Homo-oligomer: A and B are copies of this chain.
């Protein structure tokens, strides 16, 4: 599988979206799993999930790696509401356009917020819910905020450079030997290709600060079986939020990887794939 061979586009129409272009990468043909990426500069579906798509397809799933609005090859957008909710509306728009009745959701960071909002707003349209360090869930009981990683994410948005990108990735990943030229070049290309996305994210962040993303109070509504993952060494979203989710969602479990930053599905891809495939099959 390659980004090119799996690349697709679909126009969506959903509350506040009109003929809005969504890019996604699709492979496989069984039960649908939609994977939702984080909010870092240059993020997108393929970039975030290319170590996961193959094994999930091998296990018999139809995998859709979705580009959220204002990311990668999806249309540019300025959001005046919290991104989790607006992103979730876009997932519903995609599913309606593709005639997908229910999807399992996998979401990291901003994508975790997207998945939580989708589960809240459209409970009859979700299967299982998989969350990797979801962002925007209010204060930490231990971590000063904004977190170290978030400071770097904003610096990279406001002053993009290859060096600042490298700096960000060094904090993003636990194992520094994972930061290859290929990784750097790929994220840099996506940043260089879509400068308007960077500008628009910043405008959106001023309109709807991170506090507006906090759906903690509604977590008791979630009936989906939920699998929460965290990197022990995540400098972007606080580990104690894994406990917050575990205590507030009815049917959840929490899996924390040692020696793992803010990109668990990539840093610990083999274990992540096995655990999540097992969860989707058997839970």
The 8 Å CB contact of A254, one of B143, B144, B217, B256, is B256
Is B251 touching A253 in the complex (CB atoms < 8 A)?
no
User: How many copies of this chain are found per oligomer?
Assistant: 4
| Chain B residue contacts of A254, Cβ below 8 A | 254-256
Bitwise, A225-247 to B at CB < 8 A (1) or not (0) is 00000001111001110011011
| Chain B residue contacts of A282, Cβ below 8 A | 270-271, 274
Question: In this assembly, does A148 line the interface, its C-beta being within 8 Å of a C-beta of chain B?
Answer: yes
The 8 Å CB contact of A243, one of B141, B235, B270, is B141
Is A139 touching B258 in the complex (CB atoms < 8 A)?
no
| Chain B residue contacts of A233, Cβ below 8 A | 144
| Chain B residue contacts of A257, Cβ below 8 A | 253
Is A141 touching B217 in the complex (CB atoms < 8 A)?
no
Q: Roughly how many angstroms separate A244 CA and B140 CA in the complex, as a whole number?
A: 9
Is A232 touching B247 in the complex (CB atoms < 8 A)?
yes
Given contacts A246-B232, A251-B258, A255-B255, contact A142 B240 (CB under 8 A): yes
Q: Hey, which bits of chain A sit against chain B, CB under 8 A?
A: 139-144, 148, 217, 232-235, 238-240, 243-244, 246-259, 270-271, 274-275, 278, 282-283
Q: List 10 A-B contacts (CB under 8 A).
A: A141-B240, A142-B142, A142-B143, A142-B238, A143-B143, A232-B246, A249-B258, A251-B259, A253-B257, A271-B283
